[PDB]
Structure 1
Amino acid sequence: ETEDHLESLICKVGEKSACSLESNLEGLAGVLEADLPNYKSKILRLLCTVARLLPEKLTIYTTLVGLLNARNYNFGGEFVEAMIRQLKESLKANNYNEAVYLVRFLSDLVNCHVIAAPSMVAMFENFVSVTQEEDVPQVRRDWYVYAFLSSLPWVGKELYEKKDAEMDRIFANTESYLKRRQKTHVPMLQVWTADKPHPQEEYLDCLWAQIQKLKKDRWQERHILRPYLAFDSILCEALQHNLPPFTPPPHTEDSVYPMPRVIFRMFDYTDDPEGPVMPGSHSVERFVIEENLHCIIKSHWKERKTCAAQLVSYPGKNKIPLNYHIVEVIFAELFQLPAPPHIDVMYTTLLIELCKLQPGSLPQVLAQATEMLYMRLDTMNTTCVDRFINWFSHHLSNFQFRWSWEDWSDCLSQDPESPKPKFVREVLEKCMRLSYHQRILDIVPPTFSALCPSNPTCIYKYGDESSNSLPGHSVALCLAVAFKSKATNDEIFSILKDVPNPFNPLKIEVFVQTLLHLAAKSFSHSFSALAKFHEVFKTLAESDEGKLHVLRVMFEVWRNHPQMIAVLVDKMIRTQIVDCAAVANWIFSSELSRDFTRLFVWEILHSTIRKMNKHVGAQSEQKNLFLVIFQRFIMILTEHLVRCETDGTSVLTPWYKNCIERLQQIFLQHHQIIQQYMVTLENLLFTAELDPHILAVFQQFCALQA
């Protein structure tokens, strides 16, 4: 028979069916057995494949493998052997996340009487033993410990029952290791620094507390579905295999381990009093639920409608407040630092598919969550706040921008620079970009008027209002005529010669003021205007000062239209009017200092860095862009600190929070690349001479792979 049919059978088992899961498992067990003489090879590969790609269905497949071992001991043996080869093969290729699933699969296979407990206990001893290796990354020790502890919810009970002394030994070693671990990375990964109402915990300290509780509860957990408990008679009489001694692949220069993590947490049972009791933060139930949901998304993130269906149809031993769990997991992904598992916009539309699926329940939970997120803004990290802003505004544009703003009137009386009032402004500005100025003015209460974005109107220095005394006034009005008359590049140069020279700044000013003003109708006009007179630009801004002056004038022309500012910079860089370096220096200039804490400023800087990243060959220019950025960050941050030392004022000001966290963001958003420049940075910029406040960001960043 076609191998395609075999794959379909194995992939579909466990899904929606009229017959019971047990019945279907036994059924498939038969089919798989009969096709062994001719397709054993294919079957081995398929079972190994779902074991590492379909973790959310773990116990479904271990049970199947269990039933098969009972029927054909030798087959079971070759499956385990294949699994171990795959595990090594996966570790070898730095696919540690995939490896963990293989490890949980082997673990659960013990409950299926396919692997003798003693073999697993030994393999785990060699795992924890890695924490004793010398001269290796903490992230290497972490992974082996994590792979061990995260297997306990499945096989913890059985292992403790067969080798409690051995396990007590492994635990002791694990605890002493977790006690000496470095926690430098934590401040950089927390979504909130506040430990109230929910502390954002380091993933290993949290998982350990969960395991401790499980142990105290005599290894009894009430969530995991275990199909195999229904085949006790069949499985409790199968011959169990013994695993060979497992030696973890030594650390090498090529080894890349997962970064450490911090557990996102915003809910507890009190947030849903009349629903099923929500498992606590330190219960393995909360861990397994979120792990499964995260995996569901990983498997279906490309098909939003299907993804929402799978999340909502998530099965469990006991009922839990699923909607709260789903919503929490999605925000845990959107707000994950350094970055989310998938593209940001996906979470926005996924939430909408979930709303269409559960119209009577999901929407309330989401609104509730939105309220809680807003009320906890004061200590939320800047990178997460941005995503919050971008999500919420985009979300609103899909529901006619309807929202009970009066619910956040508390922000009206606060300091404008405060997280809450700033969040509202940034959101309203975002809403205008997806709509229009009047639309936003009409959707908010009169009390929020001030928080609304100013009308994105262009500003022409030589318009009606202006006096004729202004330098270049005549040349400007002259250029206006020339432009309306389709003048050429040569004609424009000639008109500009009538300008005195204080690199000529005035030439640039009059040229950019007038050109932009006449193309203010749309982005396409401005774009075509930049292209047509591309020659005048390259000549007038051949020098760095020139490029810098172009940006300065362009900013004076469109300071009320942030979106226009951004698309103009992007186009000027792509067509070489200016380069990334200039844009970077422009970001930290005096003319932009009053807008330094606004979102558009950093959106432009990051779009600039990404363009430089996609530029092959120009690796020298790439490193220099980063050097420039960090250099300016250190200058302004230092300046602030020195002045606070003198004037005797507090360092923790709203301005400081932004700047320090924006520096942090540079690392987070480009951690992958900056890695190669890491060394040079430590030698020339982030030296021991730096103020600890600044050096700390650099060290927390390194902690991600230490």
Structure 2
Amino acid sequence: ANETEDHLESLICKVGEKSACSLESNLEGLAGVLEADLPNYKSKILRLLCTVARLLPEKLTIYTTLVGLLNARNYNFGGEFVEAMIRQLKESLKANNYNEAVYLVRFLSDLVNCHVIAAPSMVAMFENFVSVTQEEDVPQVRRDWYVYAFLSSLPWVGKELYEKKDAEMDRIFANTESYLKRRQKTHVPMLQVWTADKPHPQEEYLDCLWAQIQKLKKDRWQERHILRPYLAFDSILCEALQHNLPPFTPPPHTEDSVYPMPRVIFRMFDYTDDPEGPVMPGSHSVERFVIEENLHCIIKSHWKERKTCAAQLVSYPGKNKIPLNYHIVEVIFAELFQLPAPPHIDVMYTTLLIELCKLQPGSLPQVLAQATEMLYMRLDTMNTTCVDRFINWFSHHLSNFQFRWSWEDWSDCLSQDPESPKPKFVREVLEKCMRLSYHQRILDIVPPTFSALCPANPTCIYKYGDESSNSLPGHSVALCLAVAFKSKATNDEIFSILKDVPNFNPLKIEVFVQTLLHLAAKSFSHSFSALAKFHEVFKTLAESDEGKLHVLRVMFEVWRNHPQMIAVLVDKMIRTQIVDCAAVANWIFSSELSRDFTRLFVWEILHSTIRKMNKHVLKIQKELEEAKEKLEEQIERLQEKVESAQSEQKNLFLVIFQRFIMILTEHLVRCETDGTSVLTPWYKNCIERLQQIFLQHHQIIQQYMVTLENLLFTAELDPHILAVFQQFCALQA
């Protein structure tokens, strides 16, 4: 009999959604409908409007109005709605859903211009929001937020919110002005997309928003983009009688509170990029913040469905005509490049863009190609982490569009140092495209002069093959093994041949890996099953860390002309425990990989290795979390396993760092003794990579503060390095 509960949830949403009638009528109509259904049970229409208040920000103003019309028809409704709101907000903060909580605050605020909440009533709490910046021994992050929650609402509620407490909103201003200037900015460098202050400065979020409020204040709190549904409802809204928000005291900081990490605004567009057409709001104007905040919110909702998401985006409310295409794209890349991590999964953006191009063939294409060009051109100061993502995106994007690109536009890189960003880009790009197809196809799609930066071929390197260098030890052992594998030999039949080898055995390994990878070099299918069949041989040969390292050494020596292969193997190698994480670490930081140390695949692996470690811990955490919820000597077994699962996880990061400091201080003291430049293409990558570790796996790392802080990153450490650790700390402080 809940057919009424279904129709309602529908009618609620159906108003914000497009229609063949004015938004006013839909709200007016929806009014009597819901009102007519209050005696005929309220509770639902209550828990409904509250949801739209949080999970449907992009439709903010529209639902605040609905709630308005209801107020101006039933005082007692708005009073139980606002009674609900705060309580909801009171639950959000405790669960630490600050991103969501700001949506409420922004709603409640708007309600003030809807004759529902008392103009002063809201400033009352807003004062308490700013008053937390006075609290002692509490992470800056908490402070930054409450200030965020405020300032951000103001582009809405402030126009009519300054007809009052302008006596206090001059106080709250100066109080937020002081704290704003007394805030450490340690993070910014680790969070910037580019380091170039030109042509678009990457500004801190709160340091940028303040610049958008000021433009508002001096413009008398007058904006030109937020649609007010209640402009044609002033007549019915005035006689409505506002409500009072009881005293609000922000939940005290506890060792159980988690606050949003600081963010740096992404800026790559201004009105001059698009000359002909509508004028894009300025970087410091509020409009811009508005559209961007809403677009981020549009994809926040319908990301799961790329097809719908396109439309919801292309058909945005935009009060004053804006250049949506550039705003859309700019917001996508803004998310894709969002350091540390994007809000969604990288691949999602790739596909979405493709959908957009399908939806608007006439406009979106041209822009994207213009955005690519720009992104490339500014490459030099771009942060590596973003670069990878860039490289990862485009290639994929090209694979859906017959690898068609006017490369000759980037003919400027051919005349640059290979270690330089721009050319390095095209390189890593093509290299990835090959894997999406085959090495030959790439040679036909690129210009003759770019042939140089083209991918090496996936040629296997068999040290003991057609090599006439018989002067190499264990030469025959491999040849005998060779025939052994071909004849369907077993482990014991393979041990036999190997027992007759001269010298953990450096040589016995070499002749094994090399030989098995050569007959299994054809496909990924063979190489695996091979590793699997003679798994016992592997696990016997590499029973030491020195051996586990060697395996990888030879393997690389064999497939150094085929990364994807190197990657897939290391993966399957650890999953079957033929090699562990620690080994792959000392291998990634080994002298054999120094000439490739800056190439993508390298770190890709290192991360694969890490994720697999990260996933491992979590699993054993859930298997123990489920176990306890119930012979049980299983819990003893698991508990003991968690201990070991973490221990190895700690060691991992401990290694990746210790080694990272080793190859850094090594370069810092070098350019100091010779007097050479520190900013080397290799230093850039190396140093920022150390940053990428701190950025992707921050969550876990915080667990070794006692160790990192006092042991691995102390004063004596060069400032350029320590900087990144102190940066990393700026996220949770």
SS, match of residue 465 in structure 1? coil
Q: Deviations over 1:439-488 (max 9, x none)?
A: 00111101001100111110101111332221111111111011100011
How far 1:678 sits from its partner (Å)?
2.6
Q: Deviations over 1:604-632 (max 9, x none)?
A: 0000000111113x011100111011010
Q: Within 2, Cα distance between the matches of 1:430 and 1:149?
A: 44
Q: Deviations over 1:309-331 (max 9, x none)?
A: 10000012110000000000000
Q: Within 2, Cα distance between the matches of 1:339 and 1:200?
A: 17
How far 1:162 sits from its partner (Å)?
2.0
How far 1:239 sits from its partner (Å)?
0.6
Q: Within 2, Cα distance between the matches of 1:19 and 1:399?
A: 39
Q: Within 1, Cα distance between the matches of 2:16 and 2:47?
A: 19
Q: Within 2, Cα distance between the matches of 1:144 and 1:703?
A: 17
Report whether the alignment pairs 1:81 with 2:83.
yes
SS, match of residue 414 in structure 2? helix
Q: Within 2, Cα distance between the matches of 1:399 and 1:16?
A: 32
- Which deviates more from structure 2 when the two are superposed, residues 18-27 or residues 255-264? 18-27
% same residue: 100
Q: Within 2, Cα distance between the matches of 1:19 and 1:210?
A: 34
Q: Deviations over 1:8-53 (max 9, x none)?
A: 1112112222221101101111011111013211111111111011
How far 1:573 sits from its partner (Å)?
0.4
Structure 1: segments with no counterpart, 5+ residues: none
How far 1:2 sits from its partner (Å)?
2.2
SS, match of residue 165 in structure 1? coil
How far 1:407 sits from its partner (Å)?
0.3
How far 1:641 sits from its partner (Å)?
1.0
Q: Within 1, Cα distance between the matches of 2:353 and 2:104?
A: 31
How far 1:181 sits from its partner (Å)?
0.4
How far 1:338 sits from its partner (Å)?
0.5
Q: Deviations over 1:39-92 (max 9, x none)?
A: 211111111111011011000001000000110101111111111111111111
Q: Within 2, Cα distance between the matches of 1:466 and 1:644?
A: 44
How far 1:240 sits from its partner (Å)?
0.8
- Which deviates more from structure 2 when the two are superposed, residues 398-407 or residues 36-45? 36-45
Q: Within 1, Cα distance between the matches of 2:351 and 2:60?
A: 28
- Which deviates more from structure 2 when the two are superposed, residues 255-264 or residues 465-474? 465-474
Q: Within 1, Cα distance between the matches of 2:713 and 2:575?
A: 31
- 1:46 equivalent in structure 2: 48
SS, match of residue 615 in structure 1? helix
Q: Within 2, Cα distance between the matches of 1:686 and 1:231?
A: 61
- Which deviates more from structure 2 when the two are superposed, residues 683-692 or residues 353-362? 683-692
Q: Within 2, Cα distance between the matches of 1:508 and 1:376?
A: 47
Q: Deviations over 1:78-126 (max 9, x none)?
A: 1111111111111111011111010011100000000110101111111
- Return the match for 1:359 from 351, 358, 361: 361
> Which runs of structure 2 are paired with 1:325-474 in the superposition (5 Å)?
325-474=327-476
- 2:575 equivalent in structure 1: 574
- 1:324 equivalent in structure 2: 326
SS, match of residue 413 in structure 1? coil
Q: Deviations over 1:256-278 (max 9, x none)?
A: 00000000000000000101011
How far 1:152 sits from its partner (Å)?
0.5
- Which deviates more from structure 2 when the two are superposed, residues 371-380 or residues 81-90? 81-90
Q: Within 1, Cα distance between the matches of 2:541 and 2:83?
A: 70
Aligned residues: 704
Q: Deviations over 1:179-211 (max 9, x none)?
A: 100100000000000000000000001000000
Q: Within 2, Cα distance between the matches of 1:226 and 1:16?
A: 16
SS, match of residue 59 in structure 2? helix
How far 1:698 sits from its partner (Å)?
0.4
> Which runs of structure 2 are paired with 1:174-213 in the superposition (5 Å)?
174-213=176-215
> Which runs of structure 2 are paired with 1:555-574 in the superposition (5 Å)?
555-574=556-575
SS, match of residue 410 in structure 1? coil
- Which deviates more from structure 2 when the two are superposed, residues 644-653 or residues 559-568? 644-653
- Which deviates more from structure 2 when the two are superposed, residues 463-472 or residues 211-220? 463-472
How far 1:683 sits from its partner (Å)?
2.1
SS, match of residue 493 in structure 1? helix
Q: Deviations over 1:496-555 (max 9, x none)?
A: 122111x11111011111110111100010001100100110111001111111000001
Q: Deviations over 1:119-158 (max 9, x none)?
A: 0111111111111111111000100000000001111111
- Which deviates more from structure 2 when the two are superposed, residues 454-463 or residues 346-355? 454-463
Q: Deviations over 1:578-614 (max 9, x none)?
A: 1000000000111111110000000000000001111
Q: Within 1, Cα distance between the matches of 2:164 and 2:332?
A: 39
Q: Within 2, Cα distance between the matches of 1:293 and 1:679?
A: 41
How far 1:161 sits from its partner (Å)?
1.0
Q: Within 2, Cα distance between the matches of 1:15 and 1:570?
A: 46
SS, match of residue 169 in structure 2? helix
Q: Deviations over 1:270-320 (max 9, x none)?
A: 000101011000111000000000000000000000001100000121100
- 1:131 equivalent in structure 2: 133
Q: Within 1, Cα distance between the matches of 2:318 and 2:381?
A: 35
Q: Within 1, Cα distance between the matches of 2:512 and 2:130?
A: 69
- Which deviates more from structure 2 when the two are superposed, residues 161-170 or residues 108-117? 161-170
Q: Within 2, Cα distance between the matches of 1:546 and 1:121?
A: 67
Q: Within 1, Cα distance between the matches of 2:109 and 2:413?
A: 52
Let me know the Cα RMSD of the aligned residues.
0.8
Q: Deviations over 1:409-440 (max 9, x none)?
A: 11111110000010010000001000111100
- 1:599 equivalent in structure 2: 600
How far 1:696 sits from its partner (Å)?
0.5
Q: Within 2, Cα distance between the matches of 1:281 and 1:385?
A: 23
SS, match of residue 522 in structure 2? coil
- 1:533 equivalent in structure 2: 534
Q: Within 2, Cα distance between the matches of 1:27 and 1:210?
A: 37
SS, match of residue 413 in structure 2? helix
